[PDB]
Amino acid sequence: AGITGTWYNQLGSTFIVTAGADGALTGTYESAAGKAESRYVLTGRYDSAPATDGSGTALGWTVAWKNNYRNAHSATTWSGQYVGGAEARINTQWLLTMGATEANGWASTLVGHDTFTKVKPS
Amino acid sequence: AGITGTWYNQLGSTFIVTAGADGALTGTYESAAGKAESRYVLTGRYDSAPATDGSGTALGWTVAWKNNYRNAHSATTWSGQYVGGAEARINTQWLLTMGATEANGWASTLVGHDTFTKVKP
Amino acid sequence: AGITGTWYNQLGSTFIVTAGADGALTGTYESAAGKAESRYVLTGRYDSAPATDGSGTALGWTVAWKNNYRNAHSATTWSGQYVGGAEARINTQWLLTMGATEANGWASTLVGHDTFTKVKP
Amino acid sequence: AGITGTWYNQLGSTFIVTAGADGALTGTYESAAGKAESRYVLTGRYDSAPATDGSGTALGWTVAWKNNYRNAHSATTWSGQYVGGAEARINTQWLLTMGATEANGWASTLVGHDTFTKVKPS
Ligand SMILES: O=C(CCCC[C@@H]1SC[C@@H]2NC(=O)N[C@@H]21)NC1CCN(c2ccncc2)CC1
Ligand SMILES: O=C(CCCC[C@@H]1SC[C@@H]2NC(=O)N[C@@H]21)NC1CCN(c2ccncc2)CC1
Ligand SMILES: O=C(CCCC[C@@H]1SC[C@@H]2NC(=O)N[C@@H]21)NC1CCN(c2ccncc2)CC1
Ligand SMILES: O=C(CCCC[C@@H]1SC[C@@H]2NC(=O)N[C@@H]21)NC1CCN(c2ccncc2)CC1
């Protein structure tokens, strides 16, 4: 309910998601950055019965960066929580793993943090 | 290919996954550590057309730590890659986020690394 | 250049640092969050000859959470870069490791991100 | 005492460190991987009065990847703990930040994990 909708992060990427009764997140992700174009399938999970003490709602989702137009041989997982209120927000940290050989595994994973709100960028 | 089946990490957790033709990962996770018991639903994605240059196959999945027995108000995502061969493995790094108040948000996320193999430790 | 001085992050912590000619960072950290009080010693390194292409200046530092008042048996490292300009900032990600038994090692490391500015929040 | 010495990680990198009475780590790092050659200065901190319940000793250190031969405009911090015993070990996770513009900040930080032991590679 509160999670379902269209969200945008600080890069201008577009996160369209539906939070289902079974605890699943399903939708599409469009990244404004990197080796990506148009929409990618996402799937994830969220806590469908969160605490009522003011705590956020834990969640996560994955995008593999392959669609009909491009394959960047990589995947990002976002782990975070939804925080409701006047300015609802999803605060995340993410891990992006690139397909790599063994000589290059050490350099295979980027880390970052994305904040999502429902405010469409200008 | 090669991803579908049962995998074990260094903690003894059991990762049961099916890699579908549409790039989907679907299965169950049983953690040997933390506030967890029995199996939890997992869903994720993998590169269904990986490079042919010897690179691994990038993938990720999520578990929310709620099932019919308990709810630990948290979720873990594993991000990594499958590497095939005689000693196949899925090498991952993970982020566990706990549902938290704003006063405790700074301390809400654990990070780690799990190595999954076809043979238990 | 531009690094030496007092900085504040979004939690209200105070980062007092001197960037030396030898690439060293030296100063004190006062955390507004966690098991911490008063100042802690910090030491780190920065690129003393950064690129001239508009890139930030890479740097990192460590605090062990022991001083003469308390010891929280943990240490944080911040890894990031200084970006100069009208709204200068040091953008970081951090890893806090707690001294832990092997049974709790999987849960020993927190991860986060701190943005430091010259103006308090 | 237990921390002071020469350590090697799974990549074959060489970590020469002295743990001082003031809580400081000082020494040199030589990376077997990446845009690095010869030795780099490191500095860090460790818990000089760790717990006595079997817990490890928390510590961290930083290398900026500039020396007299090369500058890779980047820095790595390792955060971890020393675990004593028959096979003493330093278990770490690390963050490597590369100098970047604003268009590229999202991709500026690699993450990984290094295990150090005193066994010299063959
Ligand atoms: O780029 C992608 C796919 C798109 C990822 C978009 C990322 S997901 C976390 C963050 N949040 C967003 O909303 N968007 C970004 N994958 C590899 C390709 C090789 N990489 C580079 C980087 C820089 N230059 C050249 C090559 C590293 C990343
Ligand atoms: O334990 C779980 C759920 C099971 C996580 C299992 C983890 S997934 C990565 C790793 N790989 C595995 O195979 N297993 C482990 N959630 C905790 C998180 C930490 N929590 C707190 C809260 C307050 N203070 C301290 C800690 C709250 C609940
Ligand atoms: O709090 C501190 C020391 C101060 C850390 C302050 C942190 S540094 C990154 C961030 N940026 C700041 O400016 N401030 C915060 N150490 C804790 C770690 C968590 N600990 C446990 C143990 C068991 N269960 C749960 C948690 C043990 C002690
Ligand atoms: O490489 C370095 C400096 C050496 C880092 C060595 C790393 S520290 C953590 C790990 N533990 C070790 O012992 N060693 C490795 N810095 C940038 C340069 C640009 N980068 C690449 C990567 C791959 N191809 C091309 C360019 C990313 C990294």
Give an overview in words.
Chains A, D: It is found in: Secreted. Chains A, D: Its main location: secreted. Chains A, D: A motif (Cell attachment site) lies at residues 45-47. Chains A, D: This is Streptavidin. Chains A, D: Biotin binds at residues 29, 40, 78, 94, 106. 4 copies of one chain form a homotetramer. Chain A has 122 residues and is mostly beta strands. Chain A has one domain. Chain A is built from no helices and 8 strands. In chain A, strands 1-2-3-4-5-6-7-8 form an 8-stranded antiparallel β-barrel. At the A-D interface, strand 8 of A face strand 8 of D. Bound molecules: the ligand O=C(CCCC[C@@H]1SC[C@@H]2NC(=O)N[C@@H]21)NC1CCN(c2ccncc2)CC1 (4 copies). One copy of the ligand O=C(CCCC[C@@H]1SC[C@@H]2NC(=O)N[C@@H]21)NC1CCN(c2ccncc2)CC1 is lined by residues 9, 11, 13, 31, 33-36, 65, 72, 74, 76, 94, 96, 98, 112, 114 of chain A.
| Class per helix and strand makeup of chain A | mainly beta
Number of domains of chain A: 1
Largest sheet of chain A: 8 strands, antiparallel, barrel
Q: Largest beta sheet of chain A: what is the strand line-up?
A: 1-2-3-4-5-6-7-8
Report helical residue fraction of chain A: under 10%
Q: Give the overall shape of chain A, derived from the CA principal axes.
A: globular
**Rg of chain A (CA only):** 15 Å
Function (chains B, C): The biological function of streptavidin is not known. Forms a strong non-covalent specific complex with biotin (one molecule of biotin per subunit of streptavidin).
Motif (Cell attachment site) (chains B, C): 45-47
Protein name (chains B, C): Streptavidin
Main location (chains B, C): secreted
